[PDB]
Design an enzyme around this catalytic site. Sequence first.
Site, PDB file in Angstrom:
ATOM      1  N   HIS A 157       0.708  -1.275   0.000  1.00 14.27           N
ATOM      2  CA  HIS A 157       0.000   0.000   0.000  1.00 14.27           C
ATOM      3  C   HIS A 157       0.737   1.327   0.000  1.00 14.27           C
ATOM      4  O   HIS A 157       0.112   2.362  -0.240  1.00 14.27           O
ATOM      5  CB  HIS A 157      -1.005   0.000   1.151  1.00 14.27           C
ATOM      6  CG  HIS A 157      -1.931  -1.173   1.131  1.00 14.27           C
ATOM      7  ND1 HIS A 157      -2.936  -1.313   0.197  1.00 14.27           N
ATOM      8  CD2 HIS A 157      -1.991  -2.271   1.919  1.00 14.27           C
ATOM      9  CE1 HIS A 157      -3.575  -2.448   0.413  1.00 14.27           C
ATOM     10  NE2 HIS A 157      -3.020  -3.048   1.451  1.00 14.27           N
TER      11      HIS A 157
ATOM     12  N   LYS B  94      -4.720  -9.771  -8.204  1.00 11.12           N
ATOM     13  CA  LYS B  94      -5.451  -9.249  -7.049  1.00 11.12           C
ATOM     14  C   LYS B  94      -6.509  -8.293  -7.601  1.00 11.12           C
ATOM     15  O   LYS B  94      -6.177  -7.330  -8.288  1.00 11.12           O
ATOM     16  CB  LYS B  94      -4.507  -8.513  -6.098  1.00 11.12           C
ATOM     17  CG  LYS B  94      -5.169  -8.031  -4.817  1.00 11.12           C
ATOM     18  CD  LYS B  94      -4.169  -7.355  -3.896  1.00 11.12           C
ATOM     19  CE  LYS B  94      -4.832  -6.883  -2.611  1.00 11.12           C
ATOM     20  NZ  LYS B  94      -3.848  -6.227  -1.707  1.00 11.12           N
TER      21      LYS B  94
ATOM     22  N   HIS C 224      -3.128  -3.303   7.718  1.00 14.84           N
ATOM     23  CA  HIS C 224      -4.198  -3.589   6.760  1.00 14.84           C
ATOM     24  C   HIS C 224      -4.850  -2.294   6.281  1.00 14.84           C
ATOM     25  O   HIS C 224      -5.044  -1.367   7.062  1.00 14.84           O
ATOM     26  CB  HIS C 224      -5.252  -4.489   7.434  1.00 14.84           C
ATOM     27  CG  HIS C 224      -6.505  -4.692   6.634  1.00 14.84           C
ATOM     28  ND1 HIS C 224      -6.555  -5.486   5.508  1.00 14.84           N
ATOM     29  CD2 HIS C 224      -7.764  -4.227   6.822  1.00 14.84           C
ATOM     30  CE1 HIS C 224      -7.788  -5.499   5.035  1.00 14.84           C
ATOM     31  NE2 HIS C 224      -8.542  -4.743   5.815  1.00 14.84           N
ATOM     32  N   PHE C 225      -5.145  -2.224   4.987  1.00 14.53           N
ATOM     33  CA  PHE C 225      -5.799  -1.045   4.407  1.00 14.53           C
ATOM     34  C   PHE C 225      -7.254  -1.495   4.348  1.00 14.53           C
ATOM     35  O   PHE C 225      -7.592  -2.438   3.627  1.00 14.53           O
ATOM     36  CB  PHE C 225      -5.264  -0.723   3.006  1.00 14.53           C
ATOM     37  CG  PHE C 225      -5.782   0.579   2.446  1.00 14.53           C
ATOM     38  CD1 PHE C 225      -5.084   1.769   2.649  1.00 14.53           C
ATOM     39  CD2 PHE C 225      -6.988   0.619   1.742  1.00 14.53           C
ATOM     40  CE1 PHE C 225      -5.582   2.985   2.164  1.00 14.53           C
ATOM     41  CE2 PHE C 225      -7.489   1.825   1.255  1.00 14.53           C
ATOM     42  CZ  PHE C 225      -6.783   3.010   1.469  1.00 14.53           C
ATOM     43  N   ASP C 226      -8.101  -0.854   5.143  1.00 18.86           N
ATOM     44  CA  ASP C 226      -9.503  -1.249   5.218  1.00 18.86           C
ATOM     45  C   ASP C 226     -10.423  -0.572   4.215  1.00 18.86           C
ATOM     46  O   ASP C 226     -11.269  -1.232   3.598  1.00 18.86           O
ATOM     47  CB  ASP C 226     -10.024  -1.013   6.638  1.00 18.86           C
ATOM     48  CG  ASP C 226     -11.139  -1.965   7.019  1.00 18.86           C
ATOM     49  OD1 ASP C 226     -10.975  -3.187   6.807  1.00 18.86           O
ATOM     50  OD2 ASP C 226     -12.159  -1.493   7.564  1.00 18.86           O
TER      51      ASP C 226
END
EC number: 4.6.1.18
Length: 122
Positions: free
Chosen positions: A12, A39, A117-119
């Site tokens: 990210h 992805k 984590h990129f939410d």
Amino acid sequence: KETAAAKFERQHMDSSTSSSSNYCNQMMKSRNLTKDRCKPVNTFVHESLADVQAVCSQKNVACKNGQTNCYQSYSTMSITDCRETGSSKYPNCAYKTTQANKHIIVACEGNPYVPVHFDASV
């Protein structure tokens, strides 16, 4: 191998860019996000690592999965959304590059407490 914190930076973070229509096609591959399969979606943040790590001490919000360790940035950030096209067929993963300025939501863990984590982006 790499730590969760390291994995977040690889998937990210892109502070070098403040890009082109070829951006996602090049980045998704260079960052190893199309090694096993294309992805579906991924977001790159164009802000310093310091500013992104700082989000872990900002607005606490509920994660999409129900966990409570997600944080939303007080200010908007430059981000690039990568979304797989229809013609895209592995190994030739094709993506649509979309730039925007939105608040990001990341999940943080560990000591030091950093993004893992990129939410979402709102």
